């Protein structure tokens, strides 16, 4: 009988039957239905009658079982007395020669904090005063303590009965087996006795002595219990810069992340931390101790650095461990992050050296070039390293492989003015075999800026200019680029001037030069030719032309703040980006009142009628996410009764199977068809059910992408900013205004709120409230705001859309 | 036709409509019976009462029960509230096809396929009667709304009308003493197979499977095994009244009358359900719903919906109206037609209804419209949207078609539509499907007029002649011109004040009440759109927005007057009463009370003495009397209710006299209140009151600070000691400075162990001896001269004021 709540009639029958097995099974079936929480008092006389005196342990044990989980509730066969049918003949049970029945009886009897059993539990310590097992003596210290807990904090429970009444706790210390139920409030002499016992311990018993009294002067003295306290005590005597090298903490710690890569990744972190405490700049974070595994002697054999190499990773162990490991290389050794990121990047970025680090997918290659290159932009020393490695990247000599390479290096030159003169000659080489945009773009920029340095350019450019591949974006990049630097410093059959001619043709003009350009018609609609066409005031010469622009870098460009940079090593970053970091007539009148922060729905129940409505009961219901914190409890609604009855309200619950409308309120009365009527007290909305939750800009952005929010409305009374009406109203449809999606200035400055919720509707809810408050001569519609809304199938989107207008209720009875 | 309900259950042999409530029972061939709340969508019960087909099903609503008959050969009675079998009885010896319940005593009738229908009395031991005649199966037994007679449809080619209180049927010749039944050729030929004959009816269509009545007619229609339906008079057994409806293709299981339409609805065991003309008695149209065969039919005796049972399940289907146009005059609701004929007026919480003569509608409603003075009703008839029909005007208090044909009142004339309009006796009509104006020449206008025409909009309903083709257009009195057009969001309704000059329109929050043309007088405060609400011409606006009728406002007061037990629409407010009718159109009325209204009419006119009487438990709530009256910043209302320890606290800061605060603060059992009121106290000016508070919040150090500022020296010392012990070094420390000598610090600091600080303080005052004590007890060296003096005079003249600022003067207003 797993859980069957109607079966009590059969149990009575089964409980006495003249067959002992049946009786045991019955009583067992009662236990299992109560434990789940089901019907049990009908049976009581039957249950109690067979078992009572006997020394036959199994039925007695079963009855003994049922007296610690419901004795108080059941009363057919027990009623209320001092020597109840729980203990009257269980004084026999306590005083049987078999330890088990006595012991069991003692154990339940003393366990209860019952006051209708207080006297019978007190000399119940007799059953276990003699200690036939470790179990008997432990059973005794726990039972005396449980007696002490049960209203006997004074002389009824404190001395000895004949050996224990609160003194097993003392005795246990010096006896062969220990266990101290003495944790609080008990004899001082036993506490003292436990200390002595630390030495003459029994190990289970030591965990009991130890919860009470901890800290040792020793190293130990033995056993897991003492050992477990000991690592706590050690952390005290050296708190300083974490544990560093984990103590006896290490054993539990592995299981704490049994799923399976995460342990190594964690372990790797600690091992890296431990090596050294470095400068602790941007991603140079290694704490713990400065010297404890050093770094870098030149006589150390086979050195520290061997372990450091693991941390430099491509994936060399698996991805979770990889992400931890790349950060960890950066963390022990660099200048900041820059130094060790360049080494690390050199390995990752595409080459002709190894083909286990090159790939023909263009974005990844490109990104890897940008990561290597960002290190230079960060720190100078890296410029010198980066440029020759970049030329190796080029040497791959696939159209695309060159292409990616050329694209970053060209950015580097914008930063690094006439420093990378050397690269230009390498960069031209792979520009001729071509099937893509990227190669043309980049090459034309290097060869263009670099012209003073070289003289090749008609020849290199011209094979490509009459070759094909994909050429949209090529136009833009060649347009600003081709002439640049020194007015007449090249010549192969086209000097720098031919280049300016070319540069202009490629931009949007027409001219025979480099055997004509591939295309002329520019990239995306805004860019066009014209700016540059106007430009080249002084023909490709460092002055105030293309050259200027080329040998200068747009805004601030420093660090790895992503200003001509990309922020570490490209593969590690994907993982970091991913991390969102999300945090019968009846009359009612009613108002909601709050006194001393108690929120209640006031209801007055009125019988305007002369007719009888007796049988009157009042209930507030649990609909779904609405709940009663206590229904109105008066038996009112009688002939010409006016009553004030208070129903307390909650807003947060779990969905019930009954209707999901406004608030259900139920009054009952006389009638047999409609004994229960549902009638209303004032408004509560569907919107309550939504649950508020919040987003950060990353979670908002991810969800924006994840599912559409095209749906918009413009809501009146969003004249005001985010903070005022809009927040308060948004709150009531369990929403909250978080992070921005705005871009403010002297022409821009709609207020933008990123909203989130996680509705109990199987959807989230998100929105952006844009408040069109004029920051221009031509506003949208002046003050008002357009709320762009969604939910996960946009079923709550709509709630956001209208619950940001207005919202107010009041009455004054 | 609209599908209200459709639940696939599999082959439903029996179907019955509850006459009390809008419920359906179905008995299935699968042996399951189900009771459905078809409007609510909630399964009431489900019983497998027999293995095989259960062919008959009935409601036994005399006490809240359902009755079923199955092929167990029994009529069983079942509880729908307790789900138990109330009683079981032996109907017959074969299939119970249909069962019917007597309302005389708990007698049950069962019709069987063993050729008898019997009635059995449970209450006693008796089987009271057996009604015999059939020679082949009584397929169905059906109640009329009177309980005296029943009809049975049997497949021996007859319909037998029975008496249930009678032995079989009940009749006796007054022209002879002999039995009505003749077994010989008389004026008709039949056998001897009855006790007597009251009415043997034709059923010839090779046996009639079912018979049923229209709720208000003696006429019955029967569907039979062939492919015809035959309509019979059961009240005379005429054969000059019986017409045959032809359309079906195979054995017609049933045919019953549609209560609410002038059509007869039939269903057959082919695959079609066919609808029949009830003024022509032949098939108007056939529908296939492709659930295959239909073995049962049902027409609602509560005139709700209509239902037919099929071999896949059953459907209850809808041919009814939703949201009808209406207006209330003084005690008369006038509404546009809905099910259950004409009803209205009276009740206030019951879903019962009762009749009064106030029918605005008494013929197909092309238009129903009130006079703006409310003295006539215009009902436009003979449908059409061509250019002509008829319009009949009725008098508003009690309505006939014509009142007298010899009197100006109740006349009729032609006009496609006619609808009343302002000037308060006028009407405007369409009689060419243009806007024509109507006069009669004095009194409420009844006579057709052809002058004046327009070329915009198209005739329909209204109350000011509403016409639509893209908007709701109000038309003028004596001008062809459009008076104005309204475009707004609606909840399917148009709400009139009661006078039909004015109109109320529903908007995004609540409703707005407006005058003639579109001019907004005010907006009803309430978050959501109300279902309906009406204004007693202006001022007292009463509305429904849920299940309760509450006043938006009366004289600036706000109240919920009372709740009803059903959702409802306000019919309008004309008089003190507000009258309501819902979708089904059951009435509720409510007297506008002097409950909530008097209380706040009184509080507004600053009467508190009046207001105490006014306080009743029909309007007490929690915050409109006992805590709403704690909402004046110069307490007035606040003074009156102050019973809550919080309201008392509040009251005190709003005056600025915190003498009451401390006590409320006390009774709020809280420290925070004492410190905050103490601060307010310092603000009224007096520091005695501040001290007491601040002392018990334990801000001895704030006090220490306050105290020279206040100019006490005695009190300042008390603070020093009781802050000494706390080691508040910006409490105990203060006071020594503040008195002319520093000695207080010296000891406190000694106890802190701050010997240095203690010496410096002491030494400077020239208490070098104490300074030395501190040095000697602790580490010496007192010689050192810090960035502050270590021995330069400290003396201050403490507080020149003789009366202190604990004794700050006050008068208090």
Which chains have the largest interface? A-B, 44 and 49 residues
Rounded to the nearest angstrom, the distance between the terminal CA atoms of chain B is: 76 Å
Main sheet specs of chain B: 4 strands, antiparallel
The percent of residues in helical segments of chain B reads 10-25%
**What is the SS-derived class of chain A?**
alpha+beta
Approximately how much beta-strand content do the residues of chain A carry?
Answer: 5-15%
Strand content of chain B: 25-35%
Strand order of the largest sheet of chain B: 1-28-27-26
Overall shape of chain A: it is: flat
Radius of gyration of chain B: 44 Å
Task: Please give the count of helices of chain B.
Answer: 13
- Please bin the fraction of helical residues of chain A: 25-40%
Protein name (chain B): Coatomer subunit alpha
GO biological process, one term (chain B): intracellular protein transport
Keywords (chain B): Cytoplasm, Cytoplasmic vesicle, ER-Golgi transport, Golgi apparatus, Hormone, Membrane, Methylation, Phosphoprotein, Protein transport, Repeat, Secreted, Transport, WD repeat
Subunit structure (chain B): Oligomeric complex that consists of at least the alpha, beta, beta', gamma, delta, epsilon and zeta subunits. Interacts with SCYL1. Interacts with JAGN1. Interacts with TMEM41B. Interacts with SVEP1. Probably interacts with PEX11A.
Summarize the helices and strands and which ones pair or pack.
The structure is cut from a larger assembly and holds chains A (813 residues) and B (813 residues).
Chain A: H1 8-15, H2 20-36, H3 44-51, H4 57-66, H5 91-94, H6 99-111, H7 118-121, H8 134-149, H9 168-174, H10 188-197, H11 203-212, H12 224-236, H13 250-255, H14 261-275, H15 305-310, H16 319-332, H17 338-348, H18 362-378, H19 381-394, H20 399-415, H21 424-428, H22 437-449, H23 457-465, H24 474-481, H25 496-507, H26 530-534, H27 546-550, H28 570-578, E1 587-595, E2 598-606, E3 617-620, E4 627-630, E5 642-650, E6 665-668, E7 676-679, H29 697-706, E8 712-715, H30 722-732, E9 736-737, E10 751-757, E11 765-771, E12 785-791, H31 797-802
Antiparallel strand pairs in A: 1-2, 2-5, 3-6, 4-5, 6-7, 8-12, 9-10, 10-11, 11-12
Helix pairs in contact in A: 1-2, 2-4, 4-6, 6-8, 9-10, 11-12, 14-16, 17-18, 17-19, 18-19, 18-20, 19-20, 20-22, 22-24, 24-25
Chain B: E1 2-8, E2 12-17, E3 23-28, E4 32-37, E5 42-48, E6 56-60, E7 65-69, E8 74-79, E9 85-90, E10 96-101, E11 107-112, E12 116-121, E13 129-132, E14 138-143, E15 149-154, E16 158-163, E17 200-202, E18 208-213, E19 219-224, E20 228-233, E21 244-246, E22 252-257, E23 263-268, E24 272-277, E25 283-288, E26 296-299, E27 306-309, E28 313-318, E29 326-328, E30 333-335, E31 367-370, E32 376-381, E33 390-395, E34 412-414, E35 417-421, E36 426-430, E37 436-438, E38 472-475, E39 482-486, E40 495-496, E41 503-506, E42 511-515, E43 519-523, E44 532-535, E45 541-544, E46 548-554, E47 557-563, E48 569-573, E49 577-581, E50 587-591, H1 596-604, H2 609-614, H3 637-640, H4 645-655, H5 659-666, H6 671-684, H7 688-697, H8 700-710, H9 714-724, H10 734-738, H11 744-752, H12 755-764, H13 768-777
Antiparallel strand pairs in B: 1-28, 2-3, 3-4, 4-5, 6-7, 7-8, 8-9, 10-11, 11-12, 12-13, 14-15, 15-16, 16-17, 18-19, 19-20, 20-21, 22-23, 23-24, 24-25, 26-27, 27-28, 29-30, 31-32, 32-33, 33-34, 35-36, 36-37, 38-39, 40-41, 41-42, 42-43, 44-45, 45-46, 46-47, 48-49, 49-50
Helix pairs in contact in B: 4-5, 5-6, 6-7, 8-9, 11-12, 12-13
């Amino acid at each position: 009988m797993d859980s069957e709540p109607p079966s009590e009639i059969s149990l009575k029958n089964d409980l006495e039957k003249g067959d002992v097995k049946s009786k045991t099974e019955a009583l067992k079936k009662v236990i299992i239905m109560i434990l789940n929480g089901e019907k049990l008092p009908g049976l009581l006389m039957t249950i109690i009658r067979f078992v009572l005196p006997l020394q036959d342990h199994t039925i007695k044990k079963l009855l003994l079982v049922f007296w610690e989980i419901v004795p108080k509730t059941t009363p057919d066969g027990r009623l209320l007395h001092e020597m109840i049918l729980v203990c009257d003949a269980y004084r026999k049970d306590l005083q049987h020669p078999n330890e088990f029945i006595r012991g069991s009886t003692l154990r339940f009897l003393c366990k209860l904090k019952e006051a209708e059993l207080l006297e019978p539990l007190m000399p119940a310590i007799r059953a276990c005063l003699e200690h036939r097992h470790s179990y008997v003596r432990r059973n005794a210290v726990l039972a005396i303590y449980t007696i002490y807990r049960n209203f006997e904090h004074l002389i009824p429970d404190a001395p000895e009965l004949i050996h224990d009444f609160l003194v097993n706790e003392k005795d246990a210390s010096c006896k062969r087996n220990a266990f101290m139920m003495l944790i609080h409030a008990d004899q001082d002499r036993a506490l003292d006795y436990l200390s002595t016992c630390i030495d003459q311990v029994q190990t289970f018993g030591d965990i009991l002595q130890l919860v009470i009294v901890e800290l040792i002067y020793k190293v130990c003295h033995a056993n897991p219990s003492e050992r477990a306290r000991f690592i706590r005590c050690i952390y005290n005597l050296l708190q300083s810069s974490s544990p560093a090298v984990k103590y006896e903490a290490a054993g539990t710690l592995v299981t704490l992340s049994s799923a399976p890569t995460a342990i190594k990744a964690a372990a790797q972190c600690y091992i890296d931390l431990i090596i050294k405490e470095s400068d602790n700049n941007v991603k140079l974070i290694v704490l713990d101790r400065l010297v404890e595994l050093k770094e870098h002697p030149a006589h150390e054999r086979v050195l520290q650095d061997l372990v450091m190499d693991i941390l430099r990773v491509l994936s060399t162990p698996d991805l979770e461990v990889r992400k931890k490991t790349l950060q960890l290389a950066l963390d022990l050794v660099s200048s900041r992050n820059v130094e060790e990121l360049v080494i690390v990047l050199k390995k990752e970025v595409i080459k002709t050296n190894n083909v286990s680090e090159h790939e023909d997918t263009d974005k990844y290659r490109q990104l890897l070039v940008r990561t290597l290159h960002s290190c230079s932009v960060r720190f100078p020393d890296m410029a010198a390293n980066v440029i020759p490695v970049l030329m190796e990247f080029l040497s791959d000599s696939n159209e695309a492989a060159a292409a990616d390479v050329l694209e970053f290096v060209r950015e580097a030159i914008q930063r690094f003015d006439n420093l990378r003169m050397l690269i230009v000659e390498k960069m031209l080489e792979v520009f001729h075999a071509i099937k893509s945009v990227k190669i043309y773009r980049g090459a034309l920029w290097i060869l263009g800026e670099y012209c003073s340095t070289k003289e090749d350019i008609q020849s290199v450019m011209t094979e490509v200019r009459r070759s094909l591949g994909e050429i949209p974006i090529v136009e833009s990049e060649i347009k600003k680029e081709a002439g640049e630097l020194k007015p007449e410093e090249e010549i192969t059959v086209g000097p720098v001037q031919k280049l300016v001619t070319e540069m202009g043709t490629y931009a949007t003009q027409s001219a025979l030069s480099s055997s004509r350009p591939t295309k002329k018609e520019e990239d995306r609609p805004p860019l066009r030719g014209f700016l540059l066409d106007g430009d080249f005031f002084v023909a490709a010469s460092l002055a105030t032309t293309l050259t200027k622009i080329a040998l200068r870098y747009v805004a601030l460009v420093q660090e790895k703040k992503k200003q001509n940079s990309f922020v570490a090593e490209a593969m590690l970053l994907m993982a970091t980006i991913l991390h969102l970091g999300k945090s019968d007539p009846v009359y009612a009148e009613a108002y909601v009142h709050v006194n001393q922060y108690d929120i209640v729905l006031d209801v007055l129940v009125v019988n305007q009628t002369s007719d009888t409505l007796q049988n009157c009961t009042l209930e507030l219901a649990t609909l779904g996410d609405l709940k009663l914190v206590e229904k109105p409890s008066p038996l009112t609604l009688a002939p010409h009764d006016f009553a004030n009855i208070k129903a307390n309200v909650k807003v947060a619950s779990t969905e019930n199977g009954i209707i999901f409308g406004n608030i259900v309120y139920d009054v009952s009365g006389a009638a047999s068809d409609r004994n229960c009527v549902v009638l209303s007290d004032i408004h509560i909305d569907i919107m309550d059910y939504i649950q508020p939750a919040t987003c950060t800009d990353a979670e908002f952005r991810q969800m924006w992408a994840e599912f559409e929010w095209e749906n918009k409305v413009t809501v009146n009374t969003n004249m005001t900013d985010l903070n005022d009406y809009l927040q308060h109203i948004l709150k009531s449809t369990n929403m909250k205004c978080l992070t921005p999606e705005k871009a403010l200035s002297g022409y821009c400055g709609f207020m933008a709120a990123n909203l989130y919720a996680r509705s109990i509707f199987g959807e989230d809810a998100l929105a952006n409230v844009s408040i069109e408050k004029p920051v221009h001569q031509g506003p949208d519609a002046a003050v008002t705001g357009h709320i762009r809304i969604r939910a996960k199938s946009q079923g709550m989107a709509l709630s956001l859309g209208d619950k940001i207008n207005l919202s107010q209720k009041k009455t004054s009875l | 036709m609209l599908t209200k309900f459709e639940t696939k259950s599999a082959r439903v042999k029996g179907l019955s409509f509850h006459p009390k409530r809008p419920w359906i029972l179905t008995s299935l061939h699968n042996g399951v019976i189900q009771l459905w709340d078809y409007r609510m969508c909630t399964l009431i019960d489900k019983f497998d009462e027999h293995d095989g087909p259960v062919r008959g099903i009935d409601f036994h609503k005399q006490q809240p029960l359902f009755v079923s008959g199955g092929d167990d050969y029994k009529i069983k009675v079942w509880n729908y509230k307790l789900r138990r079998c109330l009683f079981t009885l032996l109907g017959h010896l074969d299939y119970i096809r249909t069962t019917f319940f007597h309302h005389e005593y708990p007698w049950i009738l069962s019709a069987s396929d063993d050729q008898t229908i019997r009635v059995w009395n449970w209450q006693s031991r008796t089987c009271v009667c057996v009604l015999t005649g059939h020679n082949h199966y009584v397929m169905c037994a059906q109640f009329h709304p009177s309980e005296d007679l029943v009809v049975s449809a049997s497949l021996d080619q007859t319909v037998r009308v029975w008496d249930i209180s009678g032995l079989r049927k009940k009749n006796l010749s007054p022209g002879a003493v002999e039995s009505d039944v003749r077994g010989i050729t008389g004026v008709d030929l039949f056998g001897t197979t009855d006790a007597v004959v009251k009415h043997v009816l034709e059923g010839h269509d090779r046996g009639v499977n079912w018979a049923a009545f229209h709720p208000t007619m003696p006429l019955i229609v029967s569907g039979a095994d062939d492919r015809q339906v035959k309509i019979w008079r059961m009240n005379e057994s005429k054969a000059w009244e019986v017409d045959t409806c032809r359309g079906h293709y195979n054995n017609v299981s049933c045919a019953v009358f549609h209560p609410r339409q002038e059509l007869i609805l039939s269903n057959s065991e082919d695959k079609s359900i066919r609808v029949w003309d009830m003024s022509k008695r032949t098939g108007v149209q056939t529908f296939r719903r492709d659930h295959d065969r239909f073995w049962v039919l049902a027409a609602h005796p509560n005139l709700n919906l209509f239902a037919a049972g099929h071999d896949g399940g059953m459907i209850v289907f809808k041919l009814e109206r939703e949201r009808p146009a209406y207006a209330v005059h003084g005690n008369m609701l006038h509404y546009v037609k809905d099910r259950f004929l004409r009803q209205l007026d009276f009740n206030s919480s019951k879903d019962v209804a009762v009749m009064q003569l106030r029918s605005g509608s008494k013929f197909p409603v092309f238009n129903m419209s009130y006079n703006p003075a409310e003295n006539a009703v215009l009902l436009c008839t003979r449908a059409s949207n061509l250019e002509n029909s008829t319009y009949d005007l009725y008098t508003i208090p009690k309505d006939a078609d014509s009142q007298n044909p010899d009197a100006p009142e109740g006349k009729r004339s032609s006009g496609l539509t006619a609808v009343w309009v302002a000037r308060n006796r006028f009407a405007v009509l369409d009689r060419m499907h243009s806007l024509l104006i109507k006069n009669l020449k004095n009194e409420i206008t009844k006579k057709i007029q052809v002058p004046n025409c327009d070329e915009i909009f198209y005739a329909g309903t209204g109350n000011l002649l509403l016409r639509d083709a893209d908007s709701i257009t109000l038309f003028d009195v004596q001008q062809k011109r459009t008076l104005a057009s309204v475009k707004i969001s609606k909840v399917k309704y148009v709400i009139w004040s009661a006078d039909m000059s004015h109109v109320a329109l529903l908007a995004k929050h609540a409703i707005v009440i407006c005058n003639r043309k579109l001019d907004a007088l005010c907006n009803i405060h309430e978050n959501i759109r109300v279902k309906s609400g009406a204004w007693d011409e202006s001022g007292v606006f009463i509305y429904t927005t849920s299940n309760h009728i509450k006043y938006a406002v009366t004289t600036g007061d706000h109240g919920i007057i009372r709740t009803l037990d059903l959702p409802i629409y306000v019919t309008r407010v004309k008089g003190n009463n507000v009258y309501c009718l819902d979708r089904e159109c059951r009435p509720r009325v409510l007297t506008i009370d002097p409950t909530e209204f008097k209380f706040k009419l009184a509080l507004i006119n600053r009467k508190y003495d009046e207001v105490l009487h006014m306080v009743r438990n029909a309007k007490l709530v929690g915050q409109s009397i006992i805590a709403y009256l704690q909402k004046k910043g110069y307490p007035e209302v606040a003074l009156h209710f102050v019973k809550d320890e919080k309201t008392r606290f509040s009251l005190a800061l709003e005056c600025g006299n915190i003498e009451i605060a401390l006590e409320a603060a006390k009774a709020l059992d809280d420290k925070n209140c004492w410190e905050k009121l103490g601060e307010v106290a310092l603000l009224q000016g007096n520091h005695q009151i501040v001290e007491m508070c601040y002392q018990r919040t334990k801000n001895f150090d704030k006090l220490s600070f306050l105290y020279l500022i206040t100019g006490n020296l005695e009190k300042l010392r008390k603070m020093m000691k009781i802050a000494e012990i706390r080691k508040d070094m910006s409490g105990h420390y203060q006071n020594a400075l503040y008195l002319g000598d520093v000695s207080e610090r010296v000891r406190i600091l000694k106890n802190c162990g701050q010997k240095s600080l203690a010496y410096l303080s002491a030494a400077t005052h020239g208490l070098d001896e104490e300074a030395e004590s501190l040095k000697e007890t602790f580490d010496p060296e007192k010689e050192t001269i810090p960035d502050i003096d270590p021995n330069a005079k400290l003396l201050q003249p403490p507080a020149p004021i003789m009366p202190l600022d604990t004794n700050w003067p006050l008068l208090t207003v």
